[model samples]
Target chain A: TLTAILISSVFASAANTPTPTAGVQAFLNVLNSGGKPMEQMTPQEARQVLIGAQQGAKLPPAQVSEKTIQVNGQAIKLKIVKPENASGTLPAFMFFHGGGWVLGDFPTHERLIRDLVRASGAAAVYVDYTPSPEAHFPVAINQAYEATKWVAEHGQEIGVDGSRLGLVGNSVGGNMVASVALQAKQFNGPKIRYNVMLWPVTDANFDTASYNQFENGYFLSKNMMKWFWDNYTTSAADRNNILASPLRASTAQLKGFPETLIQTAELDVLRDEGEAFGRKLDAAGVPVTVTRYNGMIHDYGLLNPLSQEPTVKVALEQAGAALHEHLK
Target chain B: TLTAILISSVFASAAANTPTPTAGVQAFLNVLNSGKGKPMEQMTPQEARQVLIGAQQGAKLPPAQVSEKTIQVNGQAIKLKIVKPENASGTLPAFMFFHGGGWVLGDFPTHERLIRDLVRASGAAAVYVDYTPSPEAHFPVAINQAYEATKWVAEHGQEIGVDGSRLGLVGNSVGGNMVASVALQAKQFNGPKIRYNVMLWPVTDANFDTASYNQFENGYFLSKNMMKWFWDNYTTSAADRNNILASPLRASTAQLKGFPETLIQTAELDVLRDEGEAFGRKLDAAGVPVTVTRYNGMIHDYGLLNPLSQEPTVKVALEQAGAALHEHLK
Candidate 1:
């Protein structure tokens, strides 16, 4: 009932094209290996595991630099990467790194951000918000919101073309930027022109069929995501926060955000929400663009030059094109 | 019932790229829509040249040894283009491809890239059927010629060094309707056995009021008005629209029995997606081994024109279809 696409023409071929191929084989290699639950593995081990994927990712080169900024009296280190050839100032993108806001740092995300720079010709600032279970809910939220404000106020100081600023986040970062953009509208703080998220963690409910089906395997497992929510929020009321579950956020909070793009993969559990959120946004008149890449699992965007998978190449190009066109 | 919000207890998750199916369907439509100044019927042969260039941008033709030949059908010598891609060996598998143009106008070169790519990648040879188009050869004549053309290949395909045991059929859009009809008649007439079929965004029932049609009725190059226009030209009497020969969906499961396996592909952005899938379900109900693939963000036959040469779906699609052909024919 969900997809009328199940029907076929007299001549069309269905997805299970009866032939064996190598692309699906490579995608399955990393997707289905049963592994330790997220809560059991320390953040460092998780970082190494996620970061370990960078081996031979063939991520493009970037002009890298760093800056330490104070957010509400706490010093947060932000890494800045840009394309090497910048004759003139370029738009800057403030990025929130993923790891469910619990175990992410600039290092694990360095390869992806560098490739984003090469694709969009924009300077990317990788935000390092405080990890959770230590600082807990509102702390990471305040830090990320504060970090976004700092970029708007001080991006020009660090070679950013402040004229056209954008927001980009993936996974948990997708949650952060989404919340930050909403609050920005409410508070009238930072002015974000364009926003993009990949497989965002929008809703907190694990009740959907997708969650039940992908409870294990496929890289980011249901248990792993559940563990992330446990560490990200301290209690029940926090789970109901509009900023926490942006997909269920009020229309008033979602209104007036910049033009946005939400990308989802066909084979991911989060695909439903990403699609669901996009439907609401388009209804709310936010000019949302959504594209679902088939034959891909979550985190497929990060597999670039590293896995040498063909899906990675097309994923990067389409994303690169989306970034290039929308940001411009 | 306990609805525990526990606050931190739960989270859940969930899906670019276009590829040329190596279809003569997308590539041919890419050619027709390549240049659209006049209505297709109002176009001249000169305009066809200008329109053919439309296939230039996205439909990057794959490399192949292509040759044009003539075959006798119903006392008429119709033209056919033979496309063979690299890596094909021994008596290669063969498919008689009916170009989709709603019986209006489309040459074999209309699907140059798609034909080449499908042929090359599958390592098979496809006869680009150039049956008489509408206004020139109306109604059952074209369909009859299509049947004869297919049977001709089944009888004498050995002369072309193609495996007779593995002879299959492929069609796109209206071409899909043609082959599906041809496949049915091939059964009814008890001609040579058809190895299999590959349909891309086929037209089934003439009914066009379905959800997909209404949603994608406009903007997409193929419109309801255009379809009606094509049907008007192909059929003389109004009831001919629903004639089982013209509308294959009218044929019951009994008529569809003993048909070969099929590969069905549809584009989400096109009006034909629903009808195409419905026909596939009919085939499946008849116990035909069938597979269906839907390309999101694509219009009817988008692969040939807006070519995402880097599209993974395209390669995956071709490879799967190739495997089906190889397994059956080998």
Candidate 2:
């Protein structure tokens, strides 16, 4: 009888879990068809699966170029993409990709860059900063900030308008975007015109409601997040630092943060943290918009931009429209 | 026959404009009713100033310790009054007080009683700013002086037993206007962090077309014609009158956001009521912590004008205003 009660309770909890959209369900079916979860694989093997999927995909219309810039004594690679057939100067955006800070590179997020370029009619730069387990917490964030500074200072030489600058980041990259924006305020660095965060890793708190509800079964698992945080930060203190966990920033610190657009996935483990950060910005009198895409998984838009999912279309359009509104 | 016709017309308009005043307000009005003067609208700036701090109002207040100092702001010697609680010592919070006289009239001595009452209620040291009145130093001169004085308090407040980090602001009438303007300027310039603000019937807008303005244009102690005189004197140019510094009601949501926690006390029978309440709404909409109270049957600057009145509404206004200061400052 005790075992029967346990079974019934488990059924009840599963029933309350959000139903994935058809697009997500189909995508999950293919993802689960063969390989083990990224958490079970080595970091190298995980990168192969995450970055290898879109390496050869046909990118949307954009003039793509590559260069390497020295950021804080470290040579970081950059992929700059401008709107197709566009000429003269255009507003520039620095993009950071979502991969738990362990995986993802320019190729992995090129479609997202192209989507933003097409939507915003501006140039987007992808910074290939050193990932986790190799550089760790401050190294990656500092590199991202310096790269942003470089673009704001010298982007015009490359036919980019440095005066009008913005930032876009997904997942861990979103975390860096927020950390860099805060650093800009702290150091009185270059003024960032806008920030767009997609399913950002805002906090190190792993026990939030979305963390609890969508801990497993979703694309991002609690164990996977634990592994990511471990790879990105060296200690508990490191994880709790404002740069690693921007949500831990004080209200006073958040004041005067640039206008922001936060896109959250309903079924993603980082959803609650992203929205919480948006609320903090709002409380600090920073203009911010937080949107949760229902019945979607993590990396919904970047994973497959060609998917005809209605939610994906809606979210990507909103992100592009926001970038256009502020950067214009 | 023409004089009789004009007298009848005046009587009809007076009856139409009549509105109920709280008993405390009526009592205060009774003190001002020597029946020897025209309304402020019909008087010169100098003549209009005579009604602010009559001897009757000053005689009733208990004494408090006050020290005055002069500070140089933009080559101008502006007097500053520091009011502290009697026999008090410690690193207490500081509040800068701005006196309102439509930016044209009012001074340190006129608002001494009000500042003392605030000091007693909040248990913090208060700094009274005697910013230059309009027509002598117009538009932003007073605002600039007030900002400089605030910067001084924050930087040099320790000499006066003040904790510069903890700051608040209080103002009356156009003094309230300075409070809003200074807070916005601080946010934009990354100046001092003001924790709380209290505005008593602030002049938020120059346009006199709000519902309260239309309803209480006369016989409420603050008339529209008198406000026009104040505005005209403050800034001769019509364009200057609409600037955010002259009229904070025109401030954008972006500008209103991140403002300090605010408490606005408005009077239902005052022409500036709607604009004051509207500012509260704007702050609230911008996600700033704001509280707006409309005192029933009261007039503009009711609490400041009747600092020693024994009326219930007057007492309640002072008590509530003091409590807000105490709550935020303490």
Candidate 3:
């Protein structure tokens, strides 16, 4: 009788709570001291503040260059980063930056782009896709897919292998990779060899266990995600659309997804859904590997100041090795 | 309880037992016309292939226009036999054919009569894919070539007076297995949108223990041991046999769902009858518009023998094949 209540109380208060690692807590302290919570910022303030926080976080420069591509008749910018001393054609890895589909761009995510190129040994194409509240749901995903198609169709001109392709993303960018992978499967757009996702937002459901347990102080708050969903999707139905919530994809659709590597932070609000999607892919016969970085916070893979953090450094190396193995 | 047990046993026996051949002349003619050659099970794959190729002769094939083209797939040259009606004008709907030879033998020449009949019945251009036979190239390689050929047709068929947008698939025996495999890949990869599928006495399963196999295990023209030889020549891996591409019957309803409308024609005296009908039932249950017809007294490859024989059931099956194509491709 009272045993059930006691067990429930213990689960609620004791063994289930997660504490961020000291390294992750250091970055959170630095990030929080200078900026308001994302939920309280205007979109422009969030954008400016992200670049401001990147002052000491930029990695050593790669041979980064820029070009423009057409996405549904609109001109979109792309930044290409190639590794030093690269010879002949390198495999193409398309990177979509995470700003909850609104905030981050080239400046805020340049170090991550450079890291992807150095670690994966592939020429990374950074899609400066339009953000939410200005360019909503289908817009960014379609542009990302078109950018990937362009890379596959014309990558040889840039000394990249159009045939060998991979995808990498962080947070909402992770969502983009999942969405574009499904879209490619549906339309036979291009052949994607592999994908790497960091703290991906795979579903729009906000009442998950991680959302309830690590909802407030894990860098990615549930309220902030709710705001992102509101700005990106106009209707409740769009929130559940497979393009938006890849977790809702059918078994047949997921069966065609490429080999995947997902990195989830145990203390982040998006931890459960990212791992859930990886499990779904595995069940569908897809070759998938999911690693939960215990005690880390969200976007740990993208925090350049935390490069010395063992989990962050190892996650980057593992992603790079997977990319090299698949794309090489 | 005793009466109920007796009734259940009676139904089980009736279901398990094979029915007698219908009063049809073609089945008799087919068996009588088969020469006194060594059974295929006794010969090597190459020897059996030569015998099978030689056996296709003696049939008076209908006149049809044919062309040869070589296309590259995955860096390998794949030959295509394009068959069309004489004096055909404009772009015609495409009907891609994969010939059945246990995935080891048979090519455009061996299946020419079948191709000609398909062109005549559907009024569409037939692109017969001559994929690399197995023991030469195996499992996924053949299926890949088949899908790549279909993709090439959808992208480049206009050069051959064919419309890529309007496409259908036809296969006999193991070719029937390719038809289902290609359709599943197209759906899975979102490649070409196939309009319809026609499978004639198709080998839909890897298992040789089906009820039809038990009933028609020997001497109905295509024997059970001969089938095992064919499968062995094609693939010896247990895992390969279970793959959906190899055994189309093992595909789940979810995988078979959204498949194009299909017509599967099984012969009463063929060992592959039950699996073909079972695949049809699976497709139907998956909400696919599927029609499965079992010819009362026909044997394996009966549809191919229709033009040479004045068999009524073969005529009905071939006519139904044309009608389904015309209806779906419109």
Candidate 4:
């Protein structure tokens, strides 16, 4: 008991980490310097502490407002950030925010979502689905699917082309978009013309070699992830369901969904599963491209002034370009 | 354990699974049945097996001149089937082949046409090694026989018309597993260098918990039980499970260094798919150049019988493999 206490009290930082980009090292230094890790913090503290509760610079100014829509008794909030550059029905990016699927909301994901809108050159709609430990499995998936379906149907009223809909997300939001896309395919309901998944959680299985390698002190520890997954999924069957865990979906379902761009972090725990999913889509005849940001950790891209500013700029540019080319 | 035997004895014939065929495979099947072909969506195992061999017959490749040689390794005669490409002259890049039947079922006849075509297509001399199968040859014997023959095949280039220095290794299924081990072996004991390694559907790990294994565990050709039966026949010791020679996935990235550029092709519906992908990442992690080509809606060993069926993927896999082998030729 004393050993556990002593280890954490004195030596809390990760050791012998792979060298990082200048920006990543600075960002991680802030995360690792004398503060509670992500797993120990409450969800509220996670919002304020992790990224400094950074609802960062709303640059490339847009008229932003929030609204809530009801779907079969569930009232999900949607943040509409309309670009001032819009005219003649702009292509829309319907976004899902990330927090291990348990900690983030539209407010929490404000900075990254704004950056994504800047990248896409389109109106952005953020889905504020209920997070886990309260909503659990299928609730988020159902709510997300219903909201995207509604957004696809009601895009024009909000200055968006219904047919020219793109889904963009980071982390757990990445998982939501992938799962929702699969649902759309199976039901033949809504359509996603372009998709961008950044460092997504694809597989629910936590014993992967990546989890083994990046289990401790990487800001997003494996223990926090497992805790998130446990609270999100109450049963094994629920965990393995293809709709919730998109990697388990059949290749036929993955094919012909959308022209996709996937960005993965080489040092992230989700990298392998994310790459594996990309490989799956490619094998299934989906038009997909993947880029791995070398020497970067997960969530480093969320900051406005990245440790490697130019590299992060390029990643955002690539994401936006994929949306423009596919939707416009 | 008694319950295990009880269950399989009752359900060994995994409830009839429908075959999933792509266009070319469908076309071949139509010709075989004279316009009354059974849809792949619903075919008995008998019909599938019939089409399996029939597809091989239809895609008849021009045969190459084949000869046999025997190498002495571990007091056993390791029979090597030498298939020389047509019109070969100067010292050629050589490939040592290990046949796959889970180290239990395969022999020369089982893989003859496959190697014959590979020899002609790759334009390199192919040496198919008949390593001893188990229930008789356990742990190190099967692994060592393949490794020693790889060394013997590489060095005997003068006698066999190959450049020992420009040699690569190729294996399929269990053989893929073996070639990886031999790559480790050649790295461990400085011998004929492997300029490249090409593995098709290799068993890189012994763990059966991967998602692919669970998803396609039953009915997609190779079942979970069949793999366990094969492993049980080969290794009797628990310590051997983690031996790098037995499971290359267990090898640290450092130990697998110095391996040349590797090309791995995995079938989506195969039990070994995920682990094979993990192995590729491990190879890449170890600073070895690795490319993994994964096929969708496909099962294991389909090409040994019907290479023409999935022509694009198979041709591409074969070409990349050939390019890797030929890169070492000059």
Q: Number of the top candidate by lDDT?
A: 3
lDDT of 3 by residue, A1-328 (tens): 3223212222121021345555667777865676467878888887776677676774765788899987557787899999877888889889989988868888778887787788678999999888988977678887888889999999987789989999899999999999889778866779999888878998888887888888886677898999888888756656657778888776676877987877777688888788777766765767665655555788887766666664455456556755776786
Candidate 1: where are CA atoms >4 Å away?
Answer: A1-21, A30-35, A304-307, B1-330
Per-residue lDDT of candidate 1, residues B109-156 (tens digit): 667777776775457789888877776766667666677778887878
On a 0 to 100 scale, what is the lDDT of residue B301 in model 4? 69
lDDT of 4: 0.68
Query: What CAPRI-style quality would you assign to candidate 3?
Result: incorrect
Please estimate how well model 3 matches the true structure, expressed as its whole-model Cα lDDT: 0.76
Q: Summarize candidate 4's per-residue lDDT along B269-312 as a digit string, tens digits.
A: 68888788778766766667565555443567655645553443
Candidate with best TM-score: 1
Better of 1 and 4 by lDDT: 4
Candidate lDDT values, in order: 0.66, 0.75, 0.76, 0.68
lDDT of 2 at B107: 86
lDDT tens string, model 4, A26-72?
66687677655666777666666646545555555666877788877
Which residue pairs come into collision in candidate 3?
Answer: none
DockQ of each: 0.03, 0.01, 0.01, 0.03
Residue runs of model 3 more than 4 Å from their true location after superposition: A1-17, A30-35, B1-330
**Candidate 2 C-alpha lDDT tens digits along A1-328:** 3223212222121011345665577777766675577788888998998766767767778899988997555798889999899988999899988888899988888887888888678899888888888877677777788888899899987788887999999999899898788767766779898999888998777888889888887777998998898888756666656767778777776889988877777688888788778766766667665555555788888886334554555456556755765786
- Candidate 4 chain A worst ten-residue window by lDDT: A7-16
Would you give me the overall lDDT of model 1? 0.66
Question: Which candidate model has the greater lDDT, 2 or 3?
Answer: 3
